[PDB]
Amino acid sequence: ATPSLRGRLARFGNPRKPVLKPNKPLILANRVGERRREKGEATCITEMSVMMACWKQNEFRDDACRKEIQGFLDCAARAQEARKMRSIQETLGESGSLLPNKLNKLLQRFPNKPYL
Amino acid sequence: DPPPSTLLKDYQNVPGIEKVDDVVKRLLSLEMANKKEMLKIKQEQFMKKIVANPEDTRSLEARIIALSVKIRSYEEHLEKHRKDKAHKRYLLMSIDQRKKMLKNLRN
Amino acid sequence: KNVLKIRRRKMNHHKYRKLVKKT
Amino acid sequence: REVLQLQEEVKNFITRENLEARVEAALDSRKNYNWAITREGLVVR
Amino acid sequence: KFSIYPPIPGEESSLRWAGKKFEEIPIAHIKASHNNTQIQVVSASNEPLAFASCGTEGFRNAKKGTGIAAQTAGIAAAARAKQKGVIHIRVVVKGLGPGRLSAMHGLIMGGLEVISITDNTPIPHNGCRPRKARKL
Amino acid sequence: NEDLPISMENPYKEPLKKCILCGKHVDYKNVQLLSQFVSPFTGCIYGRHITGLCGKKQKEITKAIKRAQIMGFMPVTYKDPAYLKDPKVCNIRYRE
Amino acid sequence: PRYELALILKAMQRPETAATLKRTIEALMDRGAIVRDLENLGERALPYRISAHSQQHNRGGYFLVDFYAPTAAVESMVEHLSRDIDVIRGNIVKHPLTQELKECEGIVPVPLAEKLYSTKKR
Amino acid sequence: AKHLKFIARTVMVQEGNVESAYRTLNRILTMDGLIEDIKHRRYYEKPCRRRQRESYERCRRIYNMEMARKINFLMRKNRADPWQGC
Amino acid sequence: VESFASMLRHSPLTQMGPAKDKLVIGRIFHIVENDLYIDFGGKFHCVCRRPEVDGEKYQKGTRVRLRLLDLELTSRFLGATTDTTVLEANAVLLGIQ
RNA sequence: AAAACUCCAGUUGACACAAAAUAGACUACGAAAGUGGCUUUAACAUAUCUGAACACACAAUAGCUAAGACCCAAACUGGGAUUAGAUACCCCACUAUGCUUAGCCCUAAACCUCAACAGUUCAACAAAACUGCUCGCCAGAACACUACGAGCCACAGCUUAAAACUCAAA
Ligand SMILES: [Mg+2]
Ligand SMILES: [Mg+2]
Ligand SMILES: [Mg+2]
Ligand SMILES: [Mg+2]
Ligand SMILES: [Mg+2]
Ligand SMILES: [Mg+2]
Ligand SMILES: [Mg+2]
Numbered sequence A: 001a002t003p004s005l006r007g008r009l010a011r012f013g014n015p016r017k018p019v020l021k022p023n024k025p026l027i028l029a030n031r032v033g034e035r036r037r038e039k040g041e042a043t044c045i046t047e048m049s050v051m052m053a054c055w056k057q058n059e060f061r062d063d064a065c066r067k068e069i070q071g072f073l074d075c076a077a078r079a080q081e082a083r084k085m086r087s088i089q090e091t092l093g094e095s096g097s098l099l100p101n102k103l104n105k106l107l108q109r110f111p112n113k114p115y116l
Numbered sequence B: 001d002p003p004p005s006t007l008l009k010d011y012q013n014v015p016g017i018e019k020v021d022d023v024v025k026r027l028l029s030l031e032m033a034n035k036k037e038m039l040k041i042k043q044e045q046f047m048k049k050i051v052a053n054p055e056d057t058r059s060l061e062a063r064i065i066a067l068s069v070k071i072r073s074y075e076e077h078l079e080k081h082r083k084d085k086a087h088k089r090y091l092l093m094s095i096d097q098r099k100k101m102l103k104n105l106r107n
Numbered sequence C: 001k002n003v004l005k006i007r008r009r010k011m012n013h014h015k016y017r018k019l020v021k022k023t
Numbered sequence D: 001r002e003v004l005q006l007q008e009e010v011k012n013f014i015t016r017e018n019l020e021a022r023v024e025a026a027l028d029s030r031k032n033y034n035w036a037i038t039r040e041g042l043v044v045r
Numbered sequence E: 001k002f003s004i005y006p007p008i009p010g011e012e013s014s015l016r017w018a019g020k021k022f023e024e025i026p027i028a029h030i031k032a033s034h035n036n037t038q039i040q041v042v043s044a045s046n047e048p049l050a051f052a053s054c055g056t057e058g059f060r061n062a063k064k065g066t067g068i069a070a071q072t073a074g075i076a077a078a079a080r081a082k083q084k085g086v087i088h089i090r091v092v093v094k095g096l097g098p099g100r101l102s103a104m105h106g107l108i109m110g111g112l113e114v115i116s117i118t119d120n121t122p123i124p125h126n127g128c129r130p131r132k133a134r135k136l
Numbered sequence F: 001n002e003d004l005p006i007s008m009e010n011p012y013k014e015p016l017k018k019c020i021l022c023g024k025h026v027d028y029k030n031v032q033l034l035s036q037f038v039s040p041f042t043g044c045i046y047g048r049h050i051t052g053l054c055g056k057k058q059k060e061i062t063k064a065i066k067r068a069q070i071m072g073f074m075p076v077t078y079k080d081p082a083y084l085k086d087p088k089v090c091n092i093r094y095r096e
Numbered sequence G: 001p002r003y004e005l006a007l008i009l010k011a012m013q014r015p016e017t018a019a020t021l022k023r024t025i026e027a028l029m030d031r032g033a034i035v036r037d038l039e040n041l042g043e044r045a046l047p048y049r050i051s052a053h054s055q056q057h058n059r060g061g062y063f064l065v066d067f068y069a070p071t072a073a074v075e076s077m078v079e080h081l082s083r084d085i086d087v088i089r090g091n092i093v094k095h096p097l098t099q100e101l102k103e104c105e106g107i108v109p110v111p112l113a114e115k116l117y118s119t120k121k122r
Numbered sequence H: 001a002k003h004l005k006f007i008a009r010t011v012m013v014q015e016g017n018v019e020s021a022y023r024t025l026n027r028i029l030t031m032d033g034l035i036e037d038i039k040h041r042r043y044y045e046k047p048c049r050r051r052q053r054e055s056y057e058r059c060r061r062i063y064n065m066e067m068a069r070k071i072n073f074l075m076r077k078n079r080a081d082p083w084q085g086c
Numbered sequence I: 001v002e003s004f005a006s007m008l009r010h011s012p013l014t015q016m017g018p019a020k021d022k023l024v025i026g027r028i029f030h031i032v033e034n035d036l037y038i039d040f041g042g043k044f045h046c047v048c049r050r051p052e053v054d055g056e057k058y059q060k061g062t063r064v065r066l067r068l069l070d071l072e073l074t075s076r077f078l079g080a081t082t083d084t085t086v087l088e089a090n091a092v093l094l095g096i097q
Numbered sequence J: 001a002a003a004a005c006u007c008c009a010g011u012u013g014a015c016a017c018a019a020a021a022u023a024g025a026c027u028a029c030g031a032a033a034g035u036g037g038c039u040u041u042a043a044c045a046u047a048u049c050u051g052a053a054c055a056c057a058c059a060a061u062a063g064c065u066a067a068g069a070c071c072c073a074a075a076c077u078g079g080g081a082u083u084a085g086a087u088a089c090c091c092c093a094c095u096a097u098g099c100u101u102a103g104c105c106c107u108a109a110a111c112c113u114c115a116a117c118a119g120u121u122c123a124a125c126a127a128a129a130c131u132g133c134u135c136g137c138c139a140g141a142a143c144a145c146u147a148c149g150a151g152c153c154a155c156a157g158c159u160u161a162a163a164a165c166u167c168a169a170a
């Protein structure tokens, strides 16, 4: 249930102070905003931290801690193919709903009618 | 000032008044009530005192009595709360309205 | 509307207040 | 009806002579004001 | 079966952690400011057991308010708690800084078992007036 | 002319919807109902979009909740754990 | 007007609780009230630690005094309750059963507001 | 400070999914609007700016619920082409 | 001769009342993949997903039963002066015959 | 980053003359300013309408006078950064002030820039176009929220408010 718009705007005949002051007219556009891009991630920090603790505790020797060096390398790899898969998934389809351009095609088929 | 033991305006026509308990008389009296009921009693006492028919409440005289008792109430309110500007404005506008209808009734 | 007339008056008032302070 | 209904209720008022017995009776008794509402307009006590 | 609601104190509760009830598990307080993260581990009767922070663990000025710094501080606090004999822990976090979940992960990697998460962030009901806006 | 339509008030008219408390008396001492309309974790009073209450009932619920909290009948910061078992009525889904 | 006094009292024994209730009621009748009823919601834990009269209280006994008082006695009753040291919290309010319930037809449906903007091209 | 200590804003971890419990708690605070209250109370929002922001949020809410209603109303017509060759 | 008002009175579309929760038989007249286009009479047709159970006796000309949630499916939106119609009614397919 | 603090920081317990999360997706009250923690008291003019810039009553914030309060914020100022300079933006500390009582001051982009009452269905942008009646106000720009005169608990003030010279536009 949307909030009402009965006496919310400064119009003629309204005995109240305006509730809302829109800078844009409250009319549905025939467009949908584009899909916003994801932000910075800075992955692999935990595995880098544990490798990096091992280094400080063992005077930087792989032949001591191959195991979490390998863990960091795997996490870096898995992050890179995860980036690839999320890029391909976003080019393929949006999760749940549809893409903004197909939604735009629907809205061009059914335009808003703010006039007569 | 009506006495605090005066009975309410809406309650002063019931047949059983002198036989009920004194706690009931106190309960329906004006001490255990508010200033709007006190003003109703004062206004109807004035109506019985001054006008021909106290069952009109649609004439110039009745309206002047109503604004006069409201003016009295505003004066008491300001005497306690000197700094009430809203009720000071209401008192001044009531004085002007009473003067207007006084002029109309005189003319 | 732009604020060019507001700007004219703003500088007028600023210079007037500076003059009064100076004298 | 208002005056008559008010008349019989005065018989159960607290006075100076009913004070200690009424206080003890109140201490023995207990009233619960809590009740709940359902999704339907129904009261669960 | 499971309830995310914590057990009420003065009632029967079958939930146990090494025989101990919910009400006497030690508590780790993580104040996560915008420039630092401070972890203090206390018992239920308020005996301090472990205290570590980013400045304690070596980061000096602006590297303090990072995830890795809070992880390091949480690891060290969990190490001191393990020396003092702490296994299970209840986390209470205060603040919205960068190292909140990082400090929780630091406790976990240090080797403590978190059983309940509480957010005690101070939100006034319009008390003191905060600083003026930055013209940034 | 006998088959022309005629003017009447609308039949097939469903009766107007009524809130759950509509016709009920909200009292500040009824901290089981007030706890129902208070949020379980942070003690926040819910809005119309969550409670599904009409405007007058939402106003009475708000005033009674604030009154009970300042008179020492209700906790402010949390719902009573003793009343965290009542019939849920508020259209809010925290868990997943 | 008819008032209701919500009274959170100290967690005490029966004679002390009876003595405190007696003191409060006779105070009310000396200030000029006629008392309708005494109700016992009972002893229970407080929602929060109420600190009153240099004591920290965790539990309390909840009582109601439904009564009828003249207009200018509520202030005196509040001052007496403030000076009493067995009252954790006393509050005098107008009566919910004296305020009357209005009958409701139901929630009225509100439509979508129309003619907010002109029908020009824009 | 005067309330019971370990009831408000407390979630319990189930088999050790502490990350899932933290997500749940963050979801509690986001749905009750506590997080945005904290972000907006880090610095003082002057009352005129508070009123501008609340009016803007309310207009944005009105537009977004209308837009979502239109989208959900037209997704049923978003089918395959019924009469392909025109 | 019979007047149009009499026609409208002794028309089934008027004797039906509101369309909501009224069981109405209809015919399938067009199919696209698994989107069956059913007529139920009245002005518009409805579109129903093919039920996967017994999904092969749903062909062109099949008699089905419908619940008819709506008759036209229109709605007015935020800036509009008239409402947005979809030229299609709403119904739920319950079965055959 | 530096400066600053280390009589510092974290947990717990006592604790306000300050400010009033959520409710608030509500659209209310008031003449306007304004009003959103709880309780109680008093209380929200006019049974035609318009109408005082020769009056009377109010009027955000800032400010003045005197006496208090002091968590926090903060003009000014000091210190640290920045810069060619930085009397700024950025960080820290602190005062006038914001609060209360009493008295002034009487101003706002005091603007919903859209007068009151009654009623009806196109210049351009904005918030569709109008009718009857009344009051207030306006008549090229700049000089000019100025000069002078007058009034005012105002004395670096407020209200009212020109002209000369200039331009052929604004
Ligand atoms: Mg604009
Ligand atoms: Mg230094
Ligand atoms: Mg007039
Ligand atoms: Mg005037
Ligand atoms: Mg300060
Ligand atoms: Mg100071
Ligand atoms: Mg104050």
Ligand SMILES: [Mg+2]
Residues within 6 Å of the ligand: none
């Ligand atoms: Mg002023």
Ligand SMILES: [Mg+2]
Residues within 6 Å of the ligand: none
């Ligand atoms: Mg304003």
Ligand SMILES: [Mg+2]
Residues within 6 Å of the ligand: J113
């Ligand atoms: Mg104007």
Ligand SMILES: [Mg+2]
Residues within 6 Å of the ligand: J115, J116
């Ligand atoms: Mg006028």
Ligand SMILES: [Mg+2]
Residues within 6 Å of the ligand: J145
């Ligand atoms: Mg000026």
Ligand SMILES: [Mg+2]
Residues within 6 Å of the ligand: none
């Ligand atoms: Mg001047």
Ligand SMILES: [Zn+2]
Residues within 6 Å of the ligand: F018, F019, F021, F022, F023, F054, F057, G104, G106, G107
């Ligand atoms: Zn209702």
